[PDB]
């Protein structure tokens, strides 16, 4: 119980898992506050990693309204990724996503998850088309093993 970071995260449940590549991201998030009032900004970043390319892409962003001291639970529905920009190889590969919350432009928490995307029928997996068809990409989040990072920001 050290004396830092007034907003602590208690639990992040991924509600739509597995889901299609094109489905939005359902995050029920519960946290705790204190209470300076500057609203908390939540963002979900898509990071994909090919041979020659490292591609990051901001899926969606939401800001939480009042700063209620105590335990709070809200749901983050993030817009699915823009496959146009993703390197073609990483569409049906392992990628990550970065759920990150921040205060007054300074992020204090960043929860990263492993995402496995793969095709939904056995013949697409055995023989994938020369051009990826995102309609048959089903993503699957390693939600049980979150890679959490915490940073020290100045709230007051």
């Amino acid at each position: 119980q050290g004396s830092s970071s007034i907003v602590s995260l208690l639990g992040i449940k991924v509600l739509n898992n597995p889901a299609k590549f094109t489905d939005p991201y359902e995050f029920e998030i519960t946290f705790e506050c204190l209470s300076l009032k500057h609203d908390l900004e939540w963002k979900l970043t898509y990071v994909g990693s090919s041979r020659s390319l490292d591609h990051d892409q901001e899926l969606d962003s939401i800001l939480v309204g009042p700063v209620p001291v105590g335990v709070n639970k809200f749901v983050f529905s993030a817009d699915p990724p823009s496959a146009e920009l993703i390197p073609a190889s990483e569409l049906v590969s392992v990628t990550v996503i970065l759920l990150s919350c921040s205060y007054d432009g300074r992020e204090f928490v960043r929860v990263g998850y492993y995402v496995n995307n793969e095709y939904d029928e056995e013949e697409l997996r055995e023989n994938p088309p020369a051009k990826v068809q995102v309609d048959h990409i089903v993503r699957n989040i390693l939600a049980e093993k979150p890679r959490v990072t915490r940073f020290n920001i100045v709230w007051d």
Partner: antibody, heavy 117, light 107 residues
Framework: EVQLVESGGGLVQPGGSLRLSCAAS????????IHWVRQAPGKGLEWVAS????????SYADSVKGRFTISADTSKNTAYLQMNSLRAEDTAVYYC??????????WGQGTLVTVSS | IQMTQSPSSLSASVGDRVTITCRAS??????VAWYQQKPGKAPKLLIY???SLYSGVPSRFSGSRSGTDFTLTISSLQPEDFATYYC?????????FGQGTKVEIKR
């Protein structure tokens, strides 16, 4: 202040059983990941086991799969590595370390675990 | 196990520029970190997520990846940098460490 301190190291006989614990100061163990990394003398780092926040849930190296178990008690703010059916090759220093995303920022000083007859 | 790291040993001089490459099994840039270990002490974090340097590490340390070949670069070797450097791969199911690279002062 933030720090990690392992204990329980010692001598055990082949077949034996030993429980390490690592005591958390500052951060509280419930919000971070907690990992056990071992180093045989004059050998490299080897990852033993990992426990992830919010949902418990454990990863284990195959050499220790089934014999070791990893846990954390938020009330006593400590994590444990219960090593049973110990073998000679588990002889090493056992560091406990706190997770920084996919990495490990803070490391205990490490206890020596000797397994020999 | 143990990812291949090269060179496995290295004699350098102060002010040299060293590059250690870790031949990893996956391309995911988040999952690779780089550690420094002085003898009889716990290893400390240098680079996390392939390229981001841990708070309070000198700017001479820098990490970069190329496919599945991650590398740590020390732009100007300082006396205090002589040590053993390990790379790590926090994978889907396993964590893996490299054999380590020991860097010793030429005299």
């Amino acid at each position: 202040e933030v720090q990690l301190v392992e204990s329980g190291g010692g001598l055990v006989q082949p077949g034996g059983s030993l429980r390490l614990s690592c005591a958390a100061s500052g951060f509280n163990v419930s919000y971070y990941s907690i990992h056990w990394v071992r180093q045989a003398p004059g050998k490299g780092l080897e990852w033993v086991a990992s426990i992830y926040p919010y949902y418990g849930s454990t990863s284990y190296a195959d050499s220790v799969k089934g014999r070791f178990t990893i846990s954390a008690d938020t009330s006593k703010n400590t994590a444990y590595l219960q090593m049973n059916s110990l073998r000679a090759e588990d002889t090493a220093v056992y560091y406990c370390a706190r997770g920084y995303g996919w990495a490990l920022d803070y490391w205990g000083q490490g206890t020596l675990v000797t397994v020999s007859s | 196990i143990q990812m291949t790291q090269s060179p496995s040993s290295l004699s350098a001089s102060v002010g040299d520029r060293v590059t250690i490459t870790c031949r990893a099994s996956q391309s995911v840039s988040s999952a690779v970190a780089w550690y420094q270990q002085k003898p009889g002490k716990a290893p400390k974090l240098l680079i996390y997520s392939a390229s981001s340097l841990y708070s309070g590490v000198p700017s001479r340390f820098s990490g970069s990846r190329s496919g599945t070949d991650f590398t740590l670069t020390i732009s100007s070797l300082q006396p205090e940098d002589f040590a053993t450097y390990y790379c790590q791969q926090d994978g889907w199911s396993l964590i893996t460490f490299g054999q380590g690279t020991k860097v010793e002062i030429k005299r």
